[PDB]
C-alpha cells in the first residue's frame with residue numbers, strides 16, 4: 048500500500064486545497080497478461096492537492112518506489128521526436144552557459160543512456176545514475192558508464208571522489224517522480240562547483256492547467272511543478288534558480304537551471320517573469336483549481352458521451368498508443384473493451400498484453416492496419432505532430448482522430464485552419 052502525504056515536499060507547509068479526486072485507480076504502467084479473472088488487481092488512491100503556501104500540486108499518496116522504478120521496462124531506440132529533443136537539450140545546456148569540450152556531465156535517471164550519448168557526441172565526459180539495475184546494466188553494456196544507485200548525499204560524495212566535480216547535473220522526470228526532493232537538493236549542494244549547474248526538465252503546471260491535461264496525473268508523477276515552488280525549495284538548500292526555457296515536449300514542459308546561491312551564475316530576468324506570469328494566471332487562487340476540477344468533469348463526461356454516441360451509430364473505435372496517461376484517461380472515463388476494441392502500440396513488451404483496469408487489449412500497428420477502424424482515440428496526443436505526419440493513408444480513407452485536449456475535438460476539422 049501507499050503512504051499518505053503529510054507535509055509539503057517543496058516548502059514544508061501543511062495547508063492543502065483539495066482539487067480533484069479520481070478515487071482508487073490501478074497503476075498506469077502495470078500492464079497485465081490477459082485472463083478470465085482480474086479480481087486481484089491492485090488499486091491505489093489517485094487525487095491531487097494544492098499547497099496554499101508555495102502552490103506545488105501533489106498527489107495525496109505516494110506508491111512505494113521499490114514497486115515502480117526497480118524493474119522498469121524501457122524501449123531501446125526512440126521517436127524522431129525524442130532524438131531531436133535530446134539533441135536540443137544538449138545544445139541549450141552547452142551553448143547558453145558556454146560549457147567547454149571535455150567537461151563532466153552527470154545524469155540522474157539516465158536510463159538506457161541515450162541522453163548521455165548525445166553529450167558524448169558533443170565532446171563531453173559523462174556518468175549515469177539509475178537505480179533500475181536491469182536498465183543500468185544495458186547502458187553499461189553499450190559503453191555508457193552508469194552507477195546502479197539512487198541519487199542522494201551519499202551517492203554525490205561517491206561521484207565526486209571517483210569522477211570529480213561535474214559542470215552540469217541533469218535530471219529529467221526523475222524530479223517529479225522523487226518524493227524526498229530535499230535529499231536531492233542537498234546532494235546537489237555538495238556536488239556543484241562555483242559555476243556548475245543543476246538542470247531539470249518537468250511538465251509545467253501552467254501548461255497543464257490551461258490545457259486541462261488531467262490524464263498526465265498518475266501515480267508515478269508525485270509532483271506537478273511551477274517555478275515558484277522550485278524557488279521555494281531551492282531557497283532552503285543554498286541554491287538559486289538562474290534560468291528557465293519553456294519546451295513543447297510532454298504537453299508543455301520547463302527546463303530549469305539551478306546554481307549555488309553564492310556561485311558564478313547570475314539570475315536571468317526570465318525567472319521572475321515566469322513567477323509574475325504564474326501569479327497573473329491565478330496559480331495562487333483557489334478559484335483556478337475549482338475551475339480546473341470543473342473542466343475535468345466536463346471533458347470526462349463529453350468524451351465518454353462522444354465515444355458511446357459513435358459506437359451507437361455502429362462506428363468502430365480504438366486507441367492510438369498505450370501510454371501511461373491513456374490509462375488515467377480511460378479509467379477516469381470508465382471506458383471498456385465494449386467502447387475501445389483495442390489499443391495499437393509500437394512497444395513490443397506491451398503487444399499482446401491488456402490495459403490496467405479497463406482491460407482493453409493492446410495490439411501491434413500491423414494488426415491495426417488490417418482492421419477497418421473509423422475513429423482513433425489519440426492517447427499519445429503529445430506525439431500528435433509525428434503521428435499525423437505518417438498517418439496520411441488513414442486520413443485519406445476517411446479515418447478520424449479524437450483529440451482529448453484542450454477540449455475534445457475531431458481531427459481532421461471541418462474547415463481548414465488558417
Ligand SMILES: Cc1cn([C@H]2C[C@H](O)[C@@H](COP(=O)(O)OP(=O)(O)O)O2)c(=O)[nH]c1=O
Pocket residue numbers: 126297367368369370371372391392393394397427429430433434
Ligand atoms: C509516437 C508513438 C508512440 N506510441 C506509443 C508507444 C509508447 O507506449 C507510448 C509513449 O508514451 P510513454 O512512453 O508511456 O510516455 P510519454 O508519452 O511521456 O513518452 O506511445 C505509438 O504506439 N506510436 C507512435 O507513433
Ligand SMILES: [Zn+2]
Pocket residue numbers: 055056057058059060098100101102103
Ligand atoms: Zn509547499
